[PDB]
Amino acid sequence: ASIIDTVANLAKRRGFVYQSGEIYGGTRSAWDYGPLGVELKENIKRQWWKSMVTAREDVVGIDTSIILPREVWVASGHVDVFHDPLVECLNCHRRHRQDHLQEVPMDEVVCPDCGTKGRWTEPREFNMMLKTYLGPIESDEGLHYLRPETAQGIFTNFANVVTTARKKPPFGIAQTGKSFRNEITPGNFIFRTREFEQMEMEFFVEPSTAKEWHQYWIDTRLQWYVDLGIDRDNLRLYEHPPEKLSHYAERTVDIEYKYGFAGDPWGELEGIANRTDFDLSTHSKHSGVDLSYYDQATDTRYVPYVIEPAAGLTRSLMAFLIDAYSEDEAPNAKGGVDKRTVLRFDPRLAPVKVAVLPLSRHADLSPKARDLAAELRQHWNVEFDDAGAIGRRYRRQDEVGTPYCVTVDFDSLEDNAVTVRERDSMAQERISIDQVTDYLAVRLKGC
Amino acid sequence: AHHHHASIIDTVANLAKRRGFVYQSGEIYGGTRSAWDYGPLGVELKENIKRQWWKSMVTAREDVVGIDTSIILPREVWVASGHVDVFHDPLVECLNCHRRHRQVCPDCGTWTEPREFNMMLKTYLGPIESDEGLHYLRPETAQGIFTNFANVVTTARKKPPFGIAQTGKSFRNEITPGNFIFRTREFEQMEMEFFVEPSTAKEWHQYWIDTRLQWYVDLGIDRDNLRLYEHPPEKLSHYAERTVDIEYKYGFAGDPWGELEGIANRTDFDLSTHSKHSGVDLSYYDQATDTRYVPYVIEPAAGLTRSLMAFLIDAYSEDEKRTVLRFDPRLAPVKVAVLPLSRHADLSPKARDLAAELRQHWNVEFDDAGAIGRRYRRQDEVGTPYCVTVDFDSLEDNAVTVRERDSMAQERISIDQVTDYLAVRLKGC
Ligand SMILES: NCC(=O)NS(=O)(=O)OC[C@H]1O[C@@H](n2cnc3c(N)ncnc32)[C@H](O)[C@@H]1O
Ligand SMILES: NCC(=O)NS(=O)(=O)OC[C@H]1O[C@@H](n2cnc3c(N)ncnc32)[C@H](O)[C@@H]1O
Ligand SMILES: [Mg+2]
Ligand SMILES: [Mg+2]
Ligand SMILES: [Zn+2]
Ligand SMILES: [Zn+2]
Asked: Which residues are ATP-binding (chain B) (predicted)?
């Protein structure tokens, strides 16, 4: 079986993900994140926010609405150009992406729903934004779009943020949140969904420096993934050819990750575009509000250029999950060797930081173990598990990437210490209970 | 006085706009109070409230686990939940300005027959523009939890009594906006469904009412500005047998009180209807007693943006004159401000190095504009708990002055001890 299938099966079995509304018929275009998945996702997001906003003098945060005034998407150009060609099978009348079927221009292709082949309608352009209606009347007055990107909420607040945060280019505005696209086909696993969270930052610079700032952010974003544990050899850069450039972008470089898809194993992870002055210029023109920047140090006025790192939170989750997956040979209690599944997460991403495992269900072990679990829950997400053989419980934690297991044994009742097991090496060290929190805090690398 | 121990909402809203806690969404095209963006300070305050809720509900409790579910679920979910049929309110259209309102027109001064209008927002998925593609944006986050109840029982190995908690965006086609950010069409909720053996539900209901009240108090809200309001039967939602709201004294004109959080006993309504409509059994089998039952549900359902409005209003204060947001340090959006006495080659690099050290842990502001007293007032006004001054003596004793927001008391602390000094006082990161 393929690596992606193996990882997807683990994720489903341990509740990283569940298909949304599965009891009614789920698809891979919409996914829920279970108890382990919601923590992993939140940890990735928190590390992005820390790297982008908390740690940087020159980047501030914002959170804008999914549903903006419709005029925003007229001005941005999305109403006019955010569409893709659809063809309709002449036998089963299902519609498909013409470009995708052409895998470029061909002519007579096969239908992946009935197989008829050759019988297609002429192409029709299909706008990829999702629609809704606000107010009691479902009319054009009430028509709104769910945002296909978070970026326009940032651009429309550029002058507000310059004023309230007292920022001057070069500086950035960063944001996380849900975006929506009427994707015609789902992807492998969670790769391509109609609803997905993005992590986007618009970095406003003086125009003559934009190309240098573009390279800075390409290299900085690449290094962000590596610093959080992704193997650099599973990352690469991809330059958009001119025909693949979005309407707002003069140059775009994708970070791609080696997901392991059948055929071509590489996929887009994050896009880093130079959007020049397109977005502030068009909103200035359409709104009548001046979004240019006045540099008092030179008495000059200019429309900033924009460098945009635009990451996908759920695509990132998929990459971190796949990259952490590993099998190694581990001794078992019997004296033999097992194949052991381990998610080798960076400790800042792992959904459960520590597992508290009494050696057995013995009544004398539970008090100290329960008291210790309660102490650690003040700081971290913790799992308590007393069911079954200790060795099996260690492997249950290894399988979801837990960095440390703490075992309470009968000697603990006399020396008031516990055994701390490290996930990757499986090495154990005996630590006094009153120092366990500090012992873990240093190794978990939190804030 | 707002703490008995121009209205306050206008004053707080003006401050929040001036300092960028909020901006009306799409303002440059015409904003309204039904949609709001959160600026650099607002996004941090919002995230801090959310993270304290998650910590109290999920991280700190053995018996509660988390989930995050899609805004857009299969349409069949909202048929089964009853929302398609009953999530509607009476609308009265004016006969002079033809504007519809929630059943004296506040648009022309002076009426149509009431017509029931469903409050869920619709969207259309897939390539067929027609009602085959019709979906609803979720009006509550709870149905994502109920539809996964059996899934979570299996993978998390939980047994009633236990909860599943979630935060996320919900959508309602509210007809008129509220004061400030009180009632928007798009808002974030923080909801937990607590699943229990039916005979215990009324005791668990009271437990969660008291626990949720205490959560606001522990995070700094004046208990005198919170109260409990029981829904009468006519006001109960279709899924609820009993509902108690926590209300906050927002300070509106007329009646100053408003709903903050709803705590409902949803009995077995939700798991029973999805079991029936889906054909998947969402009952719980108790092996200890060889008994199978549909859990009752107790539901604390908080509003993140309504909570932000309450924490912001409650923190507002004027003393000696000085404007101060008296935030609990865990909620304050900027934890520390670093202030070089003068912007200068000998002090500024030391101040910057300290700001960078602290930004490893906390959101920090560096400010070198204007006199020090002015910079203290700028920080007090947005609730920053501590200000650290780097001055010329710092270059000799390698210590800085640390000012506490509320007392304005100052203490001189060595730089290699400042982080730990601040950590025990900020109580979170
Ligand atoms: N503002 C600039 C921009 O939007 N750029 S981008 O169009 O490239 O989307 C930015 C990122 O969002 C993620 N992403 C995009 N679409 C999807 C989807 N359907 N499912 C999952 N992740 C997605 C993906 O990781 C992508 O790199
Ligand atoms: N699941 C059970 C439930 O939903 N119950 S509830 O209907 O009460 O919504 C839960 C909470 O969401 C918040 N809330 C509700 N509607 C809005 C709105 N339009 N704007 C802002 N906040 C709102 C508010 O704080 C409310 O107490
Ligand atoms: Mg910053
Ligand atoms: Mg928990
Ligand atoms: Zn066909
Ligand atoms: Zn009227």
From this structure: 172-174, 182-187, 259-260, 303-306
Ligand nearest to the CA of A380: 4
Distance of alpha carbon A11 from alpha carbon A16, whole angstroms:
5
- Going from the C-alpha of B87 to that of each of B55, B118, B254, B297, the distances in angstroms are 32, 6, 28, 20
> For residue B161, is the peptide bond before it cis, meaning its omega torsion is within 30 degrees of 0?
yes
Decide: residue A41, CB within 10 A, 0-12 exposed, 13-18 middle, 19+ buried.
buried
Tell me whether residues B148 and A54 touch, CB distance under 8 A.
no
Among A238, A233, A265, A268, smallest CA distance to A252 is for A238
Rounded distance, CA B119 to CA B136, Å? 10
DSSP-derived secondary structure letter, B72: B
Q: Are A429 and A419 in contact (CB under 8 A)?
A: yes
Task: Please report the resolution in angstroms.
Answer: 2.0
Q: How far is CA A203 from CA A168, B28, B153, in A?
A: 11, 21, 44
Q: A164 in contact with B at a CB cutoff of 8 Å?
A: yes
Chain A residues with beta carbon closer than 8 angstroms to that of B186: 65-67
Question: Which ligand sits nearest to residue B258's alpha carbon?
Answer: 2
Handedness of CA A208, A211, A214, A219 (dihedral sign): negative
Confirm whether residue B188 is marked as ligand binding: yes
Check the annotation: does A207 bind a ligand. no
Write the CB contacts of A363 (distance below 8 Å, at least 6 apart in sequence): none
* DSSP bridge partners of B293: B284
Identify whether the C-beta of residue B294 lies closer than 8 Å to the C-beta of residue B280: no
| Torsion, CA A42, CA A46, CA A49, CA A50, rounded to 10 | -170
Select the residue from A13, A17, A24 to test the B interface by mutation, using most B Cβ atoms within 10 A: A24
Cβ-Cβ contacts under 8 Å for A332 (sequence gap 6 or more): A338, A391
Q: Please state how this structure was obtained.
A: X-ray
DSSP B381: T
